[PDB]
Design an enzyme around this catalytic site. Structure first.
Site, PDB file in Angstrom:
ATOM      1  N   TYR A 174      -4.054  -1.114 -39.583  1.00  0.00           N
ATOM      2  CA  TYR A 174      -4.668  -1.549 -38.338  1.00  0.00           C
ATOM      3  C   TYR A 174      -6.109  -1.075 -38.332  1.00  0.00           C
ATOM      4  O   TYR A 174      -7.000  -1.791 -37.886  1.00  0.00           O
ATOM      5  CB  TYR A 174      -3.915  -0.991 -37.132  1.00  0.00           C
ATOM      6  CG  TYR A 174      -4.049  -1.838 -35.908  1.00  0.00           C
ATOM      7  CD1 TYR A 174      -3.688  -3.177 -35.935  1.00  0.00           C
ATOM      8  CD2 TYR A 174      -4.512  -1.304 -34.708  1.00  0.00           C
ATOM      9  CE1 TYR A 174      -3.812  -3.969 -34.801  1.00  0.00           C
ATOM     10  CE2 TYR A 174      -4.626  -2.084 -33.581  1.00  0.00           C
ATOM     11  CZ  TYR A 174      -4.278  -3.411 -33.629  1.00  0.00           C
ATOM     12  OH  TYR A 174      -4.394  -4.168 -32.490  1.00  0.00           O
ATOM     13  N   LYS A 181      -8.702  -0.895 -29.881  1.00  0.00           N
ATOM     14  CA  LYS A 181      -7.646  -0.896 -28.867  1.00  0.00           C
ATOM     15  C   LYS A 181      -7.675   0.354 -27.996  1.00  0.00           C
ATOM     16  O   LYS A 181      -7.329   0.287 -26.819  1.00  0.00           O
ATOM     17  CB  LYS A 181      -6.249  -1.032 -29.487  1.00  0.00           C
ATOM     18  CG  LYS A 181      -5.952  -2.392 -30.096  1.00  0.00           C
ATOM     19  CD  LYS A 181      -6.070  -3.518 -29.077  1.00  0.00           C
ATOM     20  CE  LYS A 181      -5.378  -4.780 -29.569  1.00  0.00           C
ATOM     21  NZ  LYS A 181      -5.503  -5.904 -28.591  1.00  0.00           N
TER      22      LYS A 181
END
Lengths: 250, 249, 250, 249
Positions: free
Chosen positions: C156, C163
């Site tokens: 990620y 995020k």
């Protein structure tokens, strides 16, 4: 050493494998003077021996089920020490049958009560009894916790609930005693010496790709008991090689 | 409604001010069929009256201090219902003396034991006793918590430790029962009718007001429904954002 | 349906697999009236088709890189709608090369900037532009996040940082707009349709022993966009079948 | 001392009030050998003076906006040092206009971009550039964060988003480099010399006072030392317990 002049009472040292021993050794290496408790008379000799190797003759019986015994420790210790600079809570217990298998099948009212009373209530009980000796000294309490407090894990079961209670106890104790110059912090330790596979699972999945040692836990405790950490209270510090902050490790 | 035909047992409904009443009402509005417990015989009539207004005649005595009584509830309820779709834990207690002033001065062994047994152990005790009725149904448990679980706050004292235990119990219960199709979630509710606590929260939270039992109730209804089927082991804060705010002078 | 009378703008619906489609469908089933954005003109037809199946003719171009385009959406939408009751942020982007392998090797200044601008800044940018239409309506914003915000996970990488920025944005937006009757909440969704093995890893390890669906995410969004959730703001709700709260799954 | 012979590069030391100075001093007291960066040429002399008082002649220009300059630091430093044992990230910036008043009114694209690039991207950028010098040494990185990462607070605004990004960067960096023997940790420091912010914190935290740069410094020294070898990816709160308190009227 950065614990020069510090006088520290350590619970839960039952062997050289124990977390409390790692803590005792780490503190002694930084110049602390130590005292110890033992829960049952069968262990007295063994604990006195360990204490002596750590340059201490200060060993006291303390079953944390007993308010009288808890208070007596500090009355007896206060004959030797003007004050108490450090307090290490490294004790927990739950009936074995409650600590494996299905969480609900394994739990019972009695095991719940015992686990919380011995593993969680003992922190504020010890802090309360130590308070006259600790207040005004810029002193510190450290308690040991485990990831089961904040995550659902296999086999820890009711002890998870007890550790969560403990961690809240750490926060409340810190908020209570900060104004009197007493800090209270926790260490959430990774697993240490299915258990072989737990250790393997953690070493395969944490950032450090290995398990933590009692020395690593011990040194963190020594820091949290020292004036170097005077800005820190109510904190749970994870000594797990980063395990708790990793996820989705395939 | 989104709980149409769902059969839900609700603890802790002692008045129309109660969180559990807000939950009951919210669930009834979504089509749930309800049953209730009462702790002491003195409250029986009052609870039967409330139940009747919510279209229920299913009311049972349950002091969660008693394993006998807990298990008896489900034996008696099981005579009427083939199974149980929802379970609401909205009960907690600690001796009044332990819930104000200095944390260590106010705490005692007895008050600690009582607070944890009634406020925390009761969740897994109820889940365990309900398990045969709930398993295989894509059913749900909801329990009520409070910010004292995860923050040091004035006057909550030992109840904070008990709620932290409860929240862990929610996680462990969820991990335990998920495979059998039972979810377990919590709601950390803001304060609801101490006058100055309420005022402090309403002055400091994002919504600039206290939450209502309807707001807690609707969240519980959602968490008891299939709409929340992807959610388990969660503590949802219904506090108007209070817990996520800080440094507000 | 519990979104009767609600008018909701939905970003990020690029196909019937997309989280935003699950959300759109869930909201439509509860009686909401919908509008949609599309980022590039190539997708216009496909998005208009999906909108039409969801009973909407309200589709607008919005590249969130552009303040002009963002503002224009609300000017155009405001011709049709008196106000805006719901806003769904389901958009994120980072260059592919930054989203696999070693975190530091894969990261760059440009990929960082792009990822944060498109994936995180877009939330407050959209909230700000929507504010005149949303204020005073007891309205709601929902944004999609992922576990990478709060845990280190494989692959990620920089999106995790983006995020985390987003999740803070949710809190700050909630604190900003609450007094005007606008709520802002997040959903941290588990993985949905190494990716096959990620899904397998999660289904083997979470409490529900399965992956979540877009319907489950969608229904949670519908709840968070409804008045049923009027007591909830600044919250990140985990729709991951309990994954994030489990640990030490051997 | 417990950093005896450790070689540590420190960013963000612009005065004796700076957090980085507290860290430098704390590290020097434990026997570390230090090097420093300065952002602009105007500060060079002042930073060289501070370095000299801390027994260092190793000072380098580094505007973290510049990949060239970041990498040049380590090329120049590597002429003096075989390797790097510690790295301290104590830098952050956002345009002043974005750091007060209403969050949405005060934010802009440009201020967002700048805040994240300088305050968050700089951590992995520095870790990446230092990696050849740090790997295999059981070395450590420490970065400074703030409560705005994880709570909505007044006036921090877009910096809150940037610090949240940073804290994730700390976790990802730790997960990235742990296998090579490099740790990465954060300190979320309480406020340190706005007058009313400081007063609010001192009235509300467990210690009933603000933390000092010495307290932040000593924690950094610990996190840079082998004493903390079991700790990585952690954010440690040096705020006198502020973040764990709530509902204090």
């Amino acid at each position: 050493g950065f614990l020069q002049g510090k006088k520290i009472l350590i619970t839960g040292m039952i062997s050289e494998r124990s977390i409390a021993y790692g803590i005792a050794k780490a503190c002694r290496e930084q110049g602390a003077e130590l005292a110890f408790t033992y829960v049952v008379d069968k262990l007295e000799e063994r604990v006195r021996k360990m204490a002596a190797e750590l340059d201490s003759e200060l060993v006291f019986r303390c079953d944390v089920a007993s308010d009288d015994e808890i208070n007596q420790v500090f009355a007896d210790l206060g004959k030797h020490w003007d004050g108490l600079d450090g307090l290490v809570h490294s004790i927990g217990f739950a009936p074995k049958e409650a600590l494996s298998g299905d969480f609900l099948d394994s739990i019972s009212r009695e095991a719940f009560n015992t686990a919380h009373e011995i593993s969680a209530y003992s922190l504020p009980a010890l802090a309360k009894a130590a308070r006259p000796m600790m207040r005004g000294r810029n002193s510190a309490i450290v308690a040991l916790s485990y990831l089961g407090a904040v995550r659902a894990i296999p086999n820890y079961n009711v002890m998870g609930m007890a550790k969560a209670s403990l961690e809240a106890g750490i926060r409340f104790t810190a908020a209570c005693l900060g104004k009197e110059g007493i800090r209270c912090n926790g260490i959430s330790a990774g697993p240490i010496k299915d258990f072989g596979k737990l250790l393997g699972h953690v070493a395969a999945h944490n950032p450090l790709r290995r398990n933590v040692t009692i020395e690593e836990v011990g040194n963190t405790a020594a820091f949290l008991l020292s004036d170097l950490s005077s800005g820190i209270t109510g904190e749970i510090t994870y000594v797990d090689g980063g395990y708790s902050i990793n996820a989705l490790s395939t």
